[PDB]
Symmetry: D2
Subunit: 392 residues, 4 copies
Amino acid sequence: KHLDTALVNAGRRKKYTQGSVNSVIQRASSLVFDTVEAKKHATRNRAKGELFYGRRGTLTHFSLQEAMCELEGGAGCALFPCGAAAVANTILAFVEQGDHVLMTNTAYEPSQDFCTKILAKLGVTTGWFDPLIGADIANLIQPNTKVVFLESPGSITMEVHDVPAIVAAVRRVAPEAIIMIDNTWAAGVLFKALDFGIDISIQAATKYLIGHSDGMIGTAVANARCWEQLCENAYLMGQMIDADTAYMTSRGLRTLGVRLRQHHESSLRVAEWLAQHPQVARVNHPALPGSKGHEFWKRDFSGSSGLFSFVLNKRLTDAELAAYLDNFSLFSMAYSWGGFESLILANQPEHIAAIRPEAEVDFSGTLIRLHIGLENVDDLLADLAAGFARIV
Amino acid sequence: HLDTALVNAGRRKKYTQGSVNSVIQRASSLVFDTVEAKKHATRNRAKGELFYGRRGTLTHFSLQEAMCELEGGAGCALFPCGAAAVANTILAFVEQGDHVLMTNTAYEPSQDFCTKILAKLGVTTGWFDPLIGADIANLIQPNTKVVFLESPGSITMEVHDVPAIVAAVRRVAPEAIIMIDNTWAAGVLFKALDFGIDISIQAATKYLIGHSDGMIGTAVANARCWEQLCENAYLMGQMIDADTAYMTSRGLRTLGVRLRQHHESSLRVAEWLAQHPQVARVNHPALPGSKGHEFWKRDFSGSSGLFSFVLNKRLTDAELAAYLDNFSLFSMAYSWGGFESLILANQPEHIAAIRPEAEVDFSGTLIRLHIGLENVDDLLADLAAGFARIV
Amino acid sequence: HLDTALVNAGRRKKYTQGSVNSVIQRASSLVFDTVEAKKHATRNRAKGELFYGRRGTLTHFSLQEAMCELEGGAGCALFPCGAAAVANTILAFVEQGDHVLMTNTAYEPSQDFCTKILAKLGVTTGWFDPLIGADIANLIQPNTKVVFLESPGSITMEVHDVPAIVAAVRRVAPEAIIMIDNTWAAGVLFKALDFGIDISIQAATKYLIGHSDGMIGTAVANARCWEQLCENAYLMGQMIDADTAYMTSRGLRTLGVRLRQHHESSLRVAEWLAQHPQVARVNHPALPGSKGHEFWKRDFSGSSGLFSFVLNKRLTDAELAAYLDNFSLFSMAYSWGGFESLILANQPEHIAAIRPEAEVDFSGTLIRLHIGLENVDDLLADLAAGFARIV
Amino acid sequence: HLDTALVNAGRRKKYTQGSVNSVIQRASSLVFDTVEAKKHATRNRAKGELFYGRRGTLTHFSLQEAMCELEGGAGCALFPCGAAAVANTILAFVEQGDHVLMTNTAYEPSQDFCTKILAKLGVTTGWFDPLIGADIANLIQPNTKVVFLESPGSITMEVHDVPAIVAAVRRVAPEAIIMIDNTWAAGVLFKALDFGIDISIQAATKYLIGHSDGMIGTAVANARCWEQLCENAYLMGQMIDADTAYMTSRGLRTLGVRLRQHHESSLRVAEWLAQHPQVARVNHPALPGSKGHEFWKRDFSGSSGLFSFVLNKRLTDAELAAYLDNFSLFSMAYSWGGFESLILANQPEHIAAIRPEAEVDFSGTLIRLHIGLENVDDLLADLAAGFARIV
Ligand SMILES: *Cc1c(COP(=O)(O)O)cnc(C)c1O
Ligand SMILES: *Cc1c(COP(=O)(O)O)cnc(C)c1O
Ligand SMILES: *Cc1c(COP(=O)(O)O)cnc(C)c1O
Ligand SMILES: *Cc1c(COP(=O)(O)O)cnc(C)c1O
Ligand SMILES: [Mg+2]
Ligand SMILES: [Mg+2]
Ligand SMILES: [Mg+2]
Ligand SMILES: [Mg+2]
């Protein structure tokens, strides 16, 4: 009986708000020390919420960091220019040459590319696992495995991990490993990752936290064991976010509850319609019974967001792809998601297989990924129905 | 002239659309009307076509065009701050087994990135005296990949002989990546890429923003190194928000009038300090006798407002408090490049600890000043009152 | 299809230019490429062509198009806040010797504009009971130029019978300008222009912005009244900054989902208060039995989250402090329409003083609540704890 | 010490909270922790205690303090733009039956406010020649309540003899409200309140913002007039958004270095125009021979960069296009006070139409220039090429 109240109030303390409802926006590089003693005090608390230097943050950042720590149950929150920077720099913060990373083969493609194109040449190897491996992940853990990287639901194809089984297996074989999750789909709040034994919860706050498709920012909330190393190594890479975007992220939290409930209701309705449609082969929605890992979503999540995908009954030709995608009236073609607008994107099976390392896909039709926004669901259904008629 | 270029750089109709300044386009998602439009945007995702917010919007493109014009580069990568620009530009060009050769006067966070991040990834770092000049050739190893310059040096303000260093590097390792932290010159008082440096890095936070209220890093690369810088910085998710990019473009418009005042005022202060009976030496690139001044005179078109001086005595903590706590106009803070004057102190052992494989040549307390836009006679009176407190 | 319209209103390519939201164009000067371009912009300076910052930029045009679509008007004037919109919209249609007829439940600053500004300029003001309905015809004078409505009324929440009032006004004074402060409905829960009202005024500060961090007023006029409103507001220099206009457009996108929560939660709180032994009366338009509820049910498509209730006793200043000072979730502040729940107390004599020529019909302290987006159980517990402190 | 005052004005710890610049506090609702705190805020709602966003936040308070310090006033009211500041400051001091006496060189929208808004409200307007000096006494009527000055005049740049005007007004109507549009001087090059003027009004849009990307009006009043200005502007809902207030404070920090460049460059251009064979007259307050130059020299501490000149001939329509359409650096746009140079043309009869009860004394085409921060030799070359197109 608290999440909605926590979202409205998280990070909103008088020291940050100074009498307004929202935190003040403190734009600053230089932060002034009135005395040498004040400078000494600030230096000793430069990572503990005392004004020291803009790269460590201002009151606006401290307010957002407190909100993220409260909502995701962590000991600290690092901020980044975008989600991709959060993933790359959080992984980097915990590896050194000779280490091994174990990542789900459904990870967001830029996350994979960071591992294969940056980490590889820096002496860090990456292995892969099927998202439904569950307890069998233990057999893949090597003596030098330092990081296990989860993403539930997976990117595009939406497979849900059995996180309890994975975490228990990792803690049995490699108790000191750093378990991370890209928790963007859950907005960090529909899946309480740190309560499951995960060490760090990473978000592209760009998506649901910002909620309006007009700001970019990454967050990483770490437990007490991992916070200091994440904080100091992210700082050595100069990672931070501007004060105004931090303000807009805090601001987005306030409507996250009401927004996510609509995204859940509308997207599940669309998925249930698609699941009965003669032109659809498969619907990948975590909240839909029968979807991959749905039993884990039902057990471990408190709700759903609005992003999912479905497979058409056929592989669209280039001409059919253009006829389908070019003539939507409400859905817009774009990258990213999590805003008020509904989006659509297409992928051929071989496009997905190319970003499923050491694995193949199990479908042959064209995959359509939908983000269901805040439009009237009957209008969205009519848009999709017209699209079906263009490719029949 | 530079003042005209600063006023107009990056201001094209496609960005400004009737206003004086570029529009502010806040976006993650960028919409493709057709599959063909998406294909075109993908092909030009790094060439100023709208593709995805992490690659930029019209606002970023305008700033990038301004920076390329002003610094004479093929591309400009953007970062959340100067420290991110340095760390990720170096990282973009190294791999396990490589070697980085860096001036021992590099900004401390730049050194810390090398010794704490690169070292654990199998990338080693070596050091050189800022005045080493042509003799840097003897320090280039078979695996040296990056040569990192910073002229003037951090805090102590030594000016490199860049033509001598570059010629020496190109004689031994013509393919090496030469980088410079060009923040003190705001990228315009020293045309790094015209000297054969490959990448000019800036904490745009300082003079480009110019008001101490935004943080952003830039890296302008020549044609040979741009694609690797662009794509590897992108793989690390590096970008800046649209509003800060707008404020950086906006800062350019007054950069000329601001720098001229910083130069005039700071040189007056340095000249007075150079004759002062409590001052051992003044480190100001524009002051005759300062280390590398002849190279500043030859290679720079002007000066900014940041410099340092060494006191005759080592202040005690009690004297440091009496001195610094009671200034009326100078403020204690990190960073610089704004309209306000700032002051910071370092003891010699503090500087020695960030001069790897080298010794300091002074024993008194080192004071770093940023000279802002206040009336210079008011600033001189503030400094004179300070001297009276540490007699 | 209100949710769809809210998501798309004002979003045309010329404004969004590839992003989901409009670009932010900050500008005073707007540049003309040729003499012919200057002529064209001058003729269309009030018709959505870039002429001068005071007339607006692309960002303002986007919001104005959205507001005209959502409220079904011919034009939308923008103002620095709701009070500026009310004051200047009334002023735009009066001259010396005119008469204004205003509901006695009007927002107090709206009353004060009439009694302190209009009065000294030769414009008189008369008052009517919010439930007068068709009997307003007897109050219309030959010089009555404006009839000003506010439904539900400020604080006490009485709902007008707008159809009866409009029909009566048109019978007697067909040319009179009928205005309404439609802030409680966010302009969308009550379609004022469809009822024959001429101008719908909003403190967009409230639900359109929706986060308590921006101030802006809007006034949407029908075709008959738009040109006069537009030009007379412009002569008073009324405008809003581009960034606030952007944030207002942005607020529209979540307005439907927000209002539905405000409706559900506030009605649940009202139903609990209506059975509470320490409550004398609940003033919620959506609650059966409230003053004008039958008119809300018939004429509105929903409810927002602002309402009030009367305590069984008039709290003393000591009891008022014990009550208000110790709420954990409700905050004491002016304004409303945000994500946070707010509480504000008015003693009955305070209300009577801002009910011109009328008395109040209650004797307990009046508590006005804005129900935000918090968990209702927590809000009820906060209210329950308050009751325990004054029982 | 103006540069030092500009850097530090309004920058107190209560507003800056550790940063160099004031915090940006966006707010409508301002929370009261207790009933006692609310009573204190209510009592001091116009005295810098947080009460309600329409009265201001910390950001507004900081700007107001800076403006009061820089212009030597008791209070500073904020408006959405300069036109709103003029219209509402006049309206704040008149009532039906009053008379306004305004210079016939007043900014045209200021005149249109008087003839189109004030007139229908029973307030009349008279006019005087800007060089009338002591002879203004003969135009003061028993009901003259406001005397409105603008020095230099709009477009034609005539400088008032303010001491002679004020002395005459105080002899005849000591209680009259003397106002001045002090935008050209940016409120700092002419200390209006020190001359006995009651209210100094500014389009802060111009030089205070300094970058053509924000609109805001200010009015600084002496102690005698502050309360009436403050409360009556508030009844009209006049305010500015927090972010623009921040950007205005920020513009102050470079105002000194900018104005000195605008002065130096614009006077160089004026001196060149004054000796040019294609120029009939140059209207620049700092140029000897210009109308009222002796008053500028005596009463101002410097110049900005806006002025005008008259061509030797009346350009035809074709010549106007050839002249204005082909400039490379000067842009055609309204407003001024930014970093870019601007050019606009007016035929004599256009000016005569906005010179009430007066004619113009020139027959050539009038060119108004704003001289920005570009290199002045580049600007001179642009103007020279323009002369060659019409010779
Ligand atoms: C979008 C996405 C990212 C990248 O976020 P950006 O802010 O766009 O860099 C990371 N993880 C997931 C799951 C994403 O969908
Ligand atoms: C300040 C500084 C940096 C770091 O810039 P930030 O924007 O504060 O991260 C980099 N290089 C130099 C020379 C600096 O002085
Ligand atoms: C708040 C309020 C206003 C004034 O709005 P502001 O934006 O604060 O000026 C006007 N009308 C009503 C009904 C209000 O509640
Ligand atoms: C531009 C101008 C104004 C009006 O200022 P805005 O902010 O554009 O409304 C007022 N006075 C003078 C002298 C001006 O030039
Ligand atoms: Mg594969
Ligand atoms: Mg050493
Ligand atoms: Mg009464
Ligand atoms: Mg005339």
